[model samples]
Target: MFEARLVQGSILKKVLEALKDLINEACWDISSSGVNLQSMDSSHVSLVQLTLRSEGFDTYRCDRNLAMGVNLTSMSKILKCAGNEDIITLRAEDNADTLALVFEAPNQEKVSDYEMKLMDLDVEQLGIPEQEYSCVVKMPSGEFARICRDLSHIGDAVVISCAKDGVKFSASGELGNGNIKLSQTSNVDKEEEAVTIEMNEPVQLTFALRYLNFFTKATPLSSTVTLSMSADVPLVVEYKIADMGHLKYYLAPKI
Candidate 1:
């Protein structure tokens, strides 16, 4: 029998929300240290790596190292059934198909388990070459969300280009053209607070607005969002979850 319990609440909620947009289900790789997940998004255009350390949790215990694939949507529904302050417990019977999730609240308790069999996930680690990026932009997560929302309405794709001149976010289509540009300036008064530009080299990349929209949903969870890029390489967007923990997502440009 495999059983684990958490005394504090809301961790499952946050974890499920982060995963819902990109993957329906994933195998949870549990080690003595904590839990981790690394996989490309469904479209294979982006990769997401998430890690939650044991120290981040109030109570964490495991008897063995285990990897179990779970249906996220079903897990999400189970979380919704739980109260905000409910302590949650997860249990699985060895050799059994179902996994049990229990919620313990002050006045009441609930238990719901899913019977979805774990599927074989042939997930491979994507080795993206580390290169010194020419440009890096750091801005408020809300600002990135706004740009994605505004540009997506104009076209199916958005192009992000950065050079010594500045940084530009532009979308063009048969309907019309939309662009937002920001330049590095010593004068703080003239610069838009929501945008920043860096110049070590020049880089441009195109990304599908659909994926951007999905990926940016995590913006609210983080205070700052970082964008790093180089010519013809995948754009890396990182969300700072905490000092040691973070959710890093990398998306390949649509050629």
Candidate 2:
């Protein structure tokens, strides 16, 4: 048997919202430690990885490890029925074909239950390697979101040039060219508002703005975003999910 109870149901909702647009189905691995999901976008141009620690949940139990294949669209539809203030509990019997979701209202006056059928999906678990990136940039999530949105108007791809002092984003197309530069700042009252860059070596890479715009869907999940990039390597865009875990996207650079 496996079960996990979350007090803040909206966080899960936001998580689904961020992923449903890009991935059609995914395998959610449930274990004693926590929940982990890794899936590629429908177009297979990018990858999404999610981690939620068991300690972050109100209650958690897993007799054994289980990989539950779920259709993201169907799950998203079911989660829509849950109120933002509701408490969500996930339950699944060992080797079951269905996953149960229970929602309890904040006032404890209402409760709802839903059973969603699981899919038998063939998902290859990827072994992500740990490497030292050439540059790691941390900036406000909203700022990164806005940058992607604004530059996307000028081209299909955006060039990211990272230097010692700052990071620059530029795009050029038939309409024209537009560039935005974010300089490293210090002494910010709020840590999230500060822009920090750690550079081992200056690097320039061009990536599809469309995919980047999709990644920004996670902006609401965190106050700041961390972008780690290296030459000829996939850029990693990571957003911290409260204190529980992180949501990361890996998008390869364009030629």
Candidate 3:
């Protein structure tokens, strides 16, 4: 039997929200170490990867490493049944056809149980190599969310330009054009709101706005968001999860 418990509430909810937009049906590789998932979208235009370390969980166990297939949208709906203060527990068995979810209030006030049917997906997890990105932009998650929502109104794609000065997000269309620039602030009080641009060399690339908007779903999970960019390579957007894990989204630049 395999079971995982999350005592600190809201993490599971945020994790599902971060993934469900791009991953509807996928297998979660649960091992003694943690849970991991990496796959391409149905369109095969982008890749979504997730890691939730076993160390981050309040309790975790896997008698044997198991590949648990899950229907994410259904699981996402069940996770919604959990209140803000509810703790979530996941359970499965060897060769089980479904995964079970249990949510209970911290105060022993309420409890809910859900079970989702599984699928055997023929997915190939790609091996990602470490690369020295040309531009790495660290900015407020809230700012990135607002920028995508605003610019998406004017165009279908966003052009990202990074230099020694700052990083610029611009889009143009019949609705005119939108440009938002962010630079490092000297007098920044909160670390979350600070913008730090690290550039080995200048870079500019265009990416689909819809995917960026979809990635912004993780904005509620963290205050800071990171974007690693390079010419002809996919843009890597990362949001640190809790203290031990992270959610990463990779979207290929528009050709």
Candidate 4:
């Protein structure tokens, strides 16, 4: 007794691509309002939260709430069969054991269907409280992704320091050390390429580059990414999903 259809089918593909590496299996809580997922990496070092609003779907219907536990890697493999331009529809019967997926080509000349088995998972609910961050930076997603990849070659961890002038990312290892600094750009031809920072006070924190690289897997979901940080709190890395909702990752700093 639940269904949702998305015309931009590739969005789902990207979503799966972003999560498969970090979360192996997780439960998707489907409600009348939207589809929500919250899960931590197996190591419990990071958290991923996803929201797909009901209104964002081409068609959405639900008679009751449900939690569909899915293997992210398996789901990604299935999604790979769908053309990026295909329209995706999801359906499930009341108390269903499997979730059905239909992929329709744009020309309606070809169609594909798949049945994915659901699992019963024990997921711990985490309560994330709202707190103001000391520094919030909006920058290009590709840049952030590149920084993470580039730093991993030099060190295992990265120190991010946010100040009035700019934000600096530094790393040190047996090979050597390096830092990449991004200055605020007010006038830019493309808004997404601009680097803007809002700071109440300067904050410097160190985080594992490995987790950050995993988080950057979401870079394809949005043109820009937001980083929010504060003392004694996990850093928030967020990517907007087609304006329908957001995919956010949280990783605590290294001591």
Per-residue lDDT of candidate 1, residues 1-255 (tens digit): 556566655656665687787887577777667777777776688877777677765566667777777777877877877666787777665553666777887565464443445655665655556777777898888888888999888989998888766778999887798998866556556434655656687887898888778778677557778888878878888776663367777888887
How does model 3 score by TM-score? 0.95
lDDT of each: 0.73, 0.92, 0.87, 0.92
Per-residue lDDT of 173 in model 1: 80
Q: Candidates' TM-scores?
A: 0.80, 0.96, 0.95, 0.97
Whole-model lDDT, candidate 2? Answer: 0.92
RMSD (CA, Å), candidate 3 to true, equals: 1.5
Candidate 2 C-alpha error for residue 231, in Å: 0.7
Locate the minimum summed-lDDT window of 10 residues in model 4.
185-194
- Candidates 1 and 3 compared by TM-score, better number: 3
Model 2 lDDT at residue 18: 93
Which residue pairs collide, candidate 1? none
Sort the predicted structures by TM-score, highest score first. 4, 2, 3, 1
Give a tens-digit lDDT track for model 4, residues 35-143.
9999999888899999999999999999999999998888888999999999999998879899999999999998999999998898888989998999999998999
Candidate 2: how large is its RMSD?
1.5
Query: What's the CA RMSD of model 4 in angstroms?
Result: 1.3
Between candidates 1 and 2, the one scoring higher on lDDT is 2
| Tens-place lDDT digits, model 3, residues 127-228 | 999889998899889999999999999999999999999999899999699888887667746545667878999999999999898899998888889999
Over 4 Å off in model 3, which ranges?
A: 188-192
